[PDB]
Every structure is written in C-alpha cells, then in structure tokens.
Design a protein around this ligand. Structure first.
Ligand SMILES: CN(Cc1ccccc1C(=O)NCC1CCCCC1)Cc1ccc2c(c1C(=O)O)OC[C@H](CCC(=O)O)O2
Ligand SMILES: CN(Cc1ccccc1C(=O)NCC1CCCCC1)Cc1ccc2c(c1C(=O)O)OC[C@H](CCC(=O)O)O2
Ligand SMILES: [Cl-]
Ligand SMILES: [Cl-]
Lengths: 149, 149
C-alpha cells in the first residue's frame, strides 16, 4: 500500500480540480485544469510519478481508465493502471468527505488570491500540513521510508 | 539540512525551466514557464511547500530574492527566504553539472513528446529515479523521515 494512489476530480468555479490521493496517508496533490481530458490526466500522472514512487493508480472514472493517453503515461512511468470501483463502500465516502474538506479550505483562502489555481495550492498546503498527532505529509514520508527500509 | 532547497533557472527552446533542488539528496522538482517572473516563482514555491516540508529556500538570483511576491509566498508557506551566494564554491559547480545532466536527459526524451513541459517532466522522473546505491527520491524520503523520528 505505500505505492497506491487514487485519482479524484471535483468541480469549482466552472473549472475542474484534479486530485491524486495517497490512500494510506491521505496526502494529496492537486491541479486546476479547464476540463478533464486524457491528455491533462496523463500529464498530471507523469508529474506525480516523477515526485513519488507511484506503483498503482486507481483511476477516477471509466474515460480515464479507457484513455490511451492515460495508458501511455502509466506505461511510461511504470504505473499499474487500475479501475476505481469502490469494492469497499467506505472509499466512496472518504473521497466525498475529502472533496468537501478541500472546498471548505478553498473557501477559507479564496480572497487571498485572484486565481483559483493559487487557492487550490494553498488548500493542498493546508490539507497536507494539518495535524489529526501527525500530518498527512508526515504519514506519507514515514510510510514510504519504512517501505524502502 | 532536511528542509533546505535551492532554486535554479535554466533555458531551453526559448523557454525557462525553473528547478528546485533538495540540497541534501539532489532530488528535484521542475516546471516550464515562458519567463521567470516573481509571480511564477512565487506560485512554484507555493506548490513545492505544499508537497515537501520546505524550511529554507536559497533563491536563484537577486530579482527573486528582492521580489515582494516571492517574499509573500515564502511568508505564506512558512519558508525562510535566503540568498543563493555560493559561499561554498562547490555549490556553483553542482548546479552547473545538474543543468547539464537535465538538458542531456531532455535531449534523450525530446522526441517522445510535442511539448517541452512533457519532456521536462520525463527528465525529472529519470533524474529522481536514477540509482547513483540509492536514488535521489529514496534519499529525500529517508532524510525527511529520519528528521521526523
Ligand atoms: C498576484 N496575486 C496578488 C493577489 C491578488 C488577490 C488577492 C491576494 C493577492 C496576494 O498578493 N496574495 C498573497 C500571496 C501571494 C503569493 C502566493 C501566496 C499568497 C497573488 C498571486 C501570485 C502568484 C500567482 C497567482 C496569484 C493570484 O492572485 O492568484 O496566480 C497564479 C500565478 C501563476 C503563475 C503565473 O502565471 O505567473 O501565480
Ligand atoms: C499528446 N502527446 C503525443 C505525442 C506527441 C509527440 C511525440 C510523442 C507523443 C506521445 O504520445 N508520447 C508518449 C507520451 C508518454 C508520456 C506522456 C503520455 C504520452 C503526448 C503528450 C501527452 C500529454 C501532454 C502533452 C503531450 C505532448 O505531446 O507533449 O503535452 C503537454 C500536455 C499538457 C496537459 C494538457 O495541456 O492537456 O500533456
Ligand atoms: Cl508537507
Ligand atoms: Cl521517485
């Protein structure tokens, strides 16, 4: 489970926020894009996999699962591309709660930037640093380091 | 040591590649931007600090050191903004070699993408995964996890 990530797409201000969640820690990366295309999703995965040891990605929907550009990125970066079916129903609820948390944080910072992308990066920062006691950023590093050792 | 990063700006194809290097590990993050403005640099640092525990950033030049937008980002993200004077002359050589290495890798992948930004992310991936034995990606996680414990 140190290498497992889940994609998630949510909407705000007529734009799309694409999120990757490290399942075991709740650590996230996110970006704002005009729309959720295979190309945008592929590029996002390429970025993610250069930064963290991404073994498996559960895609956010069937279009990204099917996309040959997404499959090409997963091939390039050595990621196992998987579906995102919530065989465990709790997964569904966890993602929904996370999207609600993220949107709340974005609201709390929204007036500190003109552009949504800036607010989204502030929200990523707040989410990853929040102690719940360890933060998600601490959890992901500890999980991965333990795996290496 | 675990929290120290260095900014670096290099040019290719009439574009700018902005790089942050984690000093102790040699791990890097990078992006392609049209030109190196305070605003671009500020946004890059905001992204970086939401993803890694960035304590100190040695800026790449005097304009980014001076920039009130860069200072605002460092304030926001809790980063100590420092100059990049190579008091240790070896620093200057290390960055030079790294830019040369990165450009080499970009050349090796350049025909695998239309856009430079894609090639740059491929280069980041190859750089971070390269076993030198451990990779820079392994070293950064180990260094940070050891600090946490
Ligand atoms: C210029 N504004 C001024 C501003 C405008 C309105 C409200 C507050 C502030 C303000 O000063 N906030 C305080 C600080 C500023 C530092 C980051 C932390 C918060 C902030 C900004 C900086 C870099 C960006 C931005 C933006 C933006 O407004 O969203 O948008 C994307 C941009 C992308 C890179 C590119 O395209 O150059 O990078
Ligand atoms: C569409 N091309 C086709 C192509 C064109 C020329 C040569 C090879 C290939 C090719 O198929 N290479 C295989 C690679 C393997 C790794 C990544 C997946 C594809 C690749 C591509 C995908 C997403 C992008 C790109 C690009 C680009 O060409 O640079 O550019 C930035 C774009 C930004 C996000 C946005 O704007 O949507 O995301
Ligand atoms: Cl963090
Ligand atoms: Cl890595």
């Amino acid at each position: 489970s140190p290498g497992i990530w889940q994609l998630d797409c949510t909407h705000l201000e007529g734009k799309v926020i694409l999120v990757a969640v490290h399942v075991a820690s709740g650590y996230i990366e996110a970006e704002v894009i005009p729309a959720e295309t295979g190309q945008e999703t592929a590029y996002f995965l390429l970025k993610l996999a250069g930064r963290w040891p991404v073994k498996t990605v559960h895609t956010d929907n069937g279009s990204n699962f099917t996309s040959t550009t997404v499959k090409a990125a997963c091939w390039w970066a050595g990621i196992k591309q998987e579906d995102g079916i919530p065989y465990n129903p709790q997964s569904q609820g966890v993602i929904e709660s996370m999207n609600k948390e993220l949107k709340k944080i974005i609201g709390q910072v929204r007036d500190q930037a003109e552009h949504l992308k800036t607010a989204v990066q502030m929200a990523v920062f707040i989410h990853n640093h929040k102690r719940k006691g360890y933060s998600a950023g601490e959890r992901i590093v500890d999980i991965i380091a333990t795996d290496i050792q």
